Amino acid sequence: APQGLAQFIKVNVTLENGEPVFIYTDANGQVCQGDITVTQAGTITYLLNDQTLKGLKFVGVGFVTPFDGIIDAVTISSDGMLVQLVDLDKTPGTTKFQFVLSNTANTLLVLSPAPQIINRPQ
Amino acid sequence: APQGLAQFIKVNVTLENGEPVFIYTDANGQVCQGDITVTQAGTITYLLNDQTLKGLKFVGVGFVTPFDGIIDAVTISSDGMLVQLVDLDKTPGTTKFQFVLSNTANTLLVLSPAPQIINRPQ
Amino acid sequence: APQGLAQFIKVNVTLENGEPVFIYTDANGQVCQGDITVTQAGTITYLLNDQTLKGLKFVGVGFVTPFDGIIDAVTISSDGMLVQLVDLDKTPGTTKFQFVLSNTANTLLVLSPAPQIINRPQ
Amino acid sequence: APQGLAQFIKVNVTLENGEPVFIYTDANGQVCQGDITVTQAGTITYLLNDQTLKGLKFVGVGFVTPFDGIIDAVTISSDGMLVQLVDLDKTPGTTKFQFVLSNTANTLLVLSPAPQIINRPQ
Amino acid sequence: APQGLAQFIKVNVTLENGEPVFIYTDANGQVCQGDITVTQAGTITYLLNDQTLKGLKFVGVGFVTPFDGIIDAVTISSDGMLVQLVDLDKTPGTTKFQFVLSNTANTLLVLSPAPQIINRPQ
Amino acid sequence: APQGLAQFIKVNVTLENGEPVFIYTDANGQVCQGDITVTQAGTITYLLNDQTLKGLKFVGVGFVTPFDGIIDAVTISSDGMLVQLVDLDKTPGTTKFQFVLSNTANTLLVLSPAPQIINRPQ
């Protein structure tokens, strides 16, 4: 049976001037800008590396256009260290998303800036 | 003992072209742009009026600069229909925030565009 | 647009003879008896100061007559340190409530004794 | 190995004058007043029969003196229809408790009036 | 009114060769094999003694034949240290179950091997 | 940067003789036996197709040997319709797992029979 592609990205979070900075690294340790092109059905797995000392945990992935069909589903691990996106790459187009995280310093949710997902169907 | 100000805003959510649109209304039914100036300690209470048929519920309020001290705390009701912000208005400045909501159509979180809170301390 | 009043009360919890004692303090540090008169629409914000070493967290606010309309809604912060009441002060009358808290020593919920809210509509 | 006693009580909840009324029934269908004497180690199982149309669910059992040792633990089912108390009946004495329930009409927790548990150790 | 039997079993969990081993002990400290015969209506209370250093907590009790009527309900404590089974012992027969636990080392759930419950109605 | 393989399996659940039966189908609609061989790093995405009318939802994936390193992580969607496994395929070997699901008919968790994951590292 046919298998898609699994992409793996680390979401490193540091503090600069007291506020979070999101740095994505790829499977080669390279800092990457964060946008992703999806060229066939598959998954995107994000691992949190929280270096802020603010107790960050993922609570989900947010979208200003959540019904656009670019991302089919979001899954989250029980410890808030992993989120995975399912992208079946049938609907062509682009969508902006932001990571949503809790923190242990206060009761505000933390939002990343928004990368883009770009779907290029087969 | 001294009492602050309680502001009340309705967060109306409709769908246009299949995607959510956030319309804030004030205590007089007037559509307001959404930014808020806080001029003394108090609270901001947001009531959800979901007209999307997508089962929206608040899950919190997100911030790209969550440690800036403009908003002290966020509280949420058990039904996801209300969120309240505590703003003690000691730290002057401005912050951008986005509502974070779940929906019953898919597993993506929904983000509003970002209003600003502006603190003007006494 | 019209703004209500925001009241702020600290819920200090100590142990005496091994059991919790609830002491409310107002915005001037004064110990207050705990009952509140509401004279216009607004909010009541309760901040937990747990000095018991029993890991108390708010889980909500309970009522023996929960459908009486005196309190419209309860919101809670993710860390269990804040609860807020919405009181629109349309329904005149009085209601008794008790704080409900979890603790880390055992699996029993902790209840405060019951203050009263008294609504005096405009 | 030695076995304790398992008691079973139904917590029937009706509305009278728009507000909840708690009626306990025993294993013979008899209305009982609600206080329980425990004369050896065992469990007390409470089954909710909600006839209010307000969507009641147990969320726990609350105590004003939660560290008194009369009740050792509370367990709850995932549907909120059952709560069980563990009473090892080593500590003699009495304690007052109140059921704590959520409802689907509003975000206030519902509290029962308080029965007593009376421990008479072997 | 008629009272059933309350059975109490400790679920001791150790690590051998890096993996969990479940050892049940009865009310006399005796290691028992784990299967239980139920001869009248009652409850079975399982207390977790986690000696693995892996932060185990019960999250429930699982069944491959969950609709067979042998066990009527499962309740769980808020700290994950206790699970209780309600067995009304009307339906005669046997069922296999496995404890389900979370752990703090990873995001996989932990399953015990399966004991049997055997119902012998009165 | 290097990309792994994403496998997609549907977990169809029917009732036969009142009890759940798990039928896995692959990306071609073929019924498959359920065991999976993993030959490089990647993900396994399981979509629930519940045809039981018992309101099944995934709550996680359980393991009798959860620290064996074959599966690195489990993620779950908010609606309980998807679970995903991360398998980095560094640790060679095999592990047995069972799906864990809640249901709306009773408070017992539902367990599948156990497929195997077999890791063959590159």
Of D8, D77, D86, the CB nearest to E74: D77
Distance CA E36, CA F69 (A): 33
Please report all neighbours of A, defined by 3+ CB atom pairs within 8 A. B, C, E, F
End-to-end CA distance of chain C: 17
Size (chain D), residues: 122
Closest CA to E67 of D57, F16, C24, A102: F16
CA C41/CA B5 separation, integer angstroms: 10
Task: Say how far apart CA D103 and CA E16 lie, in whole Å.
Answer: 46
For chain B, the chains sharing at least 3 beta-carbon pairs closer than 8 angstroms are A, C, D, F
| C-beta atoms of D62 and C100 within 8 A | yes
Report the residue from C71, C106, C108 with minimal CB separation from D108.
Answer: C71
SS (HEC) of E54-117: CCCEEEEEEECCCCCCCCCEEEECCCCCEEEEEECCCCCEEEEEEEEEECCCCCCEEECCCCEE
- Provide the token pair at A121: 């169907």
Residue of E nearest to A76 (CA): E107
Report the relative pairing of strands E57-63 and F109-111 from DSSP bridges: parallel
Paired with B24 in beta bridges are B11, B32
DSSP D120: -
> For residue C46, which phi and psi values (nearest 5 degrees)?
-110, 120
Instruction: Give the contacts of F20 (CB within 8 A, at least 6 positions apart).
Output: E64, E66, E67, F13, F14, F52, F54, F56, F110, F112
Neighbours of B3 (CB within 10 A): 19
Is the torsion defined by CA of A31, A37, A40, A46 positive or negative? positive
Answer whether A14's CB lies under 8 Å from A52's CB. yes
C13, C49 contact by CB (below 8 A):
yes
d(CA E18, CA D119): 43
Instruction: Report strand pairing: F36-38 vs F116-119.
Output: parallel
F56 φ, ψ (degrees, to nearest 5): -70, 140
Whole-number CA gyration radius for chain A = 14
Alpha-carbon distance of D110 to D104, in angstroms, equals: 11
Residue B85 identity: L
For residue A111, say whether it is annotated as part of any ligand binding site.
no
Residue of D106, B66, B41, B27 lying closest to C85 (CA atoms)? D106
Chain E residues within 8 A (CB-CB) of chain D?
1-8, 26-28, 30, 32, 41-43, 45, 60, 73-78, 81-84, 86
Could you give the CA distance from residue D79 to residue D44 in angstroms, rounded to a whole number?
18
Q: Choose the closest CB to E6 out of D28, D30, D43.
A: D43
Strands D93-102 and D57-63, how do they pair? antiparallel
Nearest to C34 by CA among C67, C1, C11: C11
Partners of residue E117 on adjacent β-strands: E36, E95
The closest of B88, C44, A77, C41 to F75, measured between CA atoms, is A77
Q: List the one residue out of C62, C65, C63, C71 whose CA is nearest residue C42.
A: C71
Sign of CA dihedral D58, D59, D65, D69: positive
Which amino acid is it at D114? Answer: A
Does the distance separating the beta carbons of A110 and B62 come in below 8 Å?
A: yes
C-alpha dihedral sign at D32, D75, D95, D2: positive
Separation CA C98–CA D114 (nearest Å): 12
Residues of F in contact with D78 (CB under 8 A): 102, 107
Angstrom distances, CA of residue C29 to CA of A2, D9, E14, E101, F111? 68, 46, 51, 45, 55
Option in A18, A63, A110 nearest B111 (CB): A63
Chain A hits for C79, CB-CB cut-off 8 Å, are 104, 107
Across the E/F interface, how many CB contacts are shorter than 8 Å? 109
Q: Is F89 annotated as a binding residue?
A: yes
State which amino acid sits at residue E90.
K
CA distance E47 to E44: 10
**In sequence order, what DSSP letters do the residues of C49-92 get, joined into one string?**
EE-SSS--EEEEEEESSTTSSSS-EEEE-TTSSEEEEEE---S-
Length of chain A (residues) = 122
Structure tokens at D55: 């969507």
Pairing state of beta strands C19-25 and C4-16? Answer: antiparallel
Give, in order, the Cα–Cα distances in Å from D112 to each of B50, D11, D17, D109: 33, 10, 16, 10
Alpha-carbon separation of residue B96 from B114, B118, D7, E90, F114 (angstroms) = 6, 9, 56, 61, 49
**Closest approach of D2 to chain E, Cα-based (Å):** 6
Q: Which residues of D touch C (CB under 8 A)?
A: 18-20, 54, 59-68, 71-75, 98, 100, 102-103, 105-113
Of A108, B81, D62, give the one whose Cα is nearest residue C64. D62
Say if residues E36 and E61 touch (Cβ distance below 8 Å).
no
What does the alpha-carbon distance between residue A96 and residue A118 come to, in Å, rounded to a whole number? 9
| Residues A20, A13: Cα–Cα separation, whole Å | 6
Each residue of C35-71: b (16+ CB within 10 Å) or e? ebebebbbbbbbbbebebebebbbbbbbbbbbbbbbb
Contact in structure between D18 and C64 (CB atoms under 8 Å): no
Which of C46, C78, C84 to substitute to test the interface with A, most A CBs within 10 Å? C78
CA distances to B23, B24, C118 from B19, rounded to whole Å, are: 13, 16, 43
For residue E31, give the chain D residue with the closest CA: D1
As a whole number of angstroms, the distance between CA B12 and CA B10 comes to: 6
Structure tokens at E94: 């046997």
- What are the structural domain ranges in chain C? 1-122
Report chain F residues whose CB lies below 8 A from the CB of E102. Answer: 60
Distance from CA of F81 to the nearest CA of B (A): 9
Residue count (chain F) = 122
Structure tokens at B100: 């974070």
The candidate with the shortest Cα–Cα distance to A44, out of A73, A1, A68, A12, is A73
Question: CB–CB of E74/E61 below 8 Å?
Answer: yes
Evaluated on CA atoms E55, E61, E65, E67, the torsion sign reads: negative
Question: Is the pair C, E in contact (3+ CB pairs within 8 Å)?
Answer: yes
Amino acid, res. B94: T
Nearest one of F36, F46, F60 to F12, comparing CA atoms? F46
Query: Which amino acid is present at D34?
Result: G
Q: What backbone phi and psi angles, to 5 degrees, belong to C56?
A: -70, 140
A6 and A27 in contact (C-beta within 8 Å)? no
CA distances from C114 to D7, D70, F44 (A): 30, 22, 53
- Tell me which chain A residue has its CA closest to the CA of residue E107: A78
- Strand, coil or helix: F39: coil
- Cβ E44 vs Cβ E75: under 8 Å: no
Q: Do B60 and C78 touch (CB under 8 A)?
A: yes
How far apart (Å, rounded) are the C-alpha atoms in residues D71 and E69?
Answer: 29
Separation CA C115–CA C63 (nearest Å): 11
Report which residue type is found at C65: T
Distance separating alpha carbons of residues A107 and B74, to the nearest angstrom: 6
- The CATH class for the domain spanning C1-122 reads mainly beta
| Residues of chain A contacting C78 with CB distance shorter than 8 Å | 102, 107
CA distances (Å), origin D95, targets D65, D68, D115, F95? 7, 8, 8, 49
Out of B3, B28, B84, the one facing C5 most closely (by C-beta) is B3
Give the residue on D whose Cα is nearest the Cα of C98.
Answer: D111
Q: How many CB pairs under 8 A join D and E?
A: 88
Name F28's Cβ contacts closer than 8 Å, sequence gap at least 6: A1, A2
Three-state DSSP string of A95-106 = EEEEEEEECCCC
Per-position DSSP letters for A68-120, written without gaps between them: SSSS-EEEE-TTSSEEEEEE---S-EEEEEEEEEE-SS-SSEEE----EEEE-
Nearest neighbour of B102 by CB, restricted to F78, F81, F82: F78
**How far is residue A37's CA from residue F2's CA, in Å, rounded to a whole number?**
14
Q: What is the DSSP letter of F117?
A: E
F42-50 and F82-87: which strand pairing? antiparallel
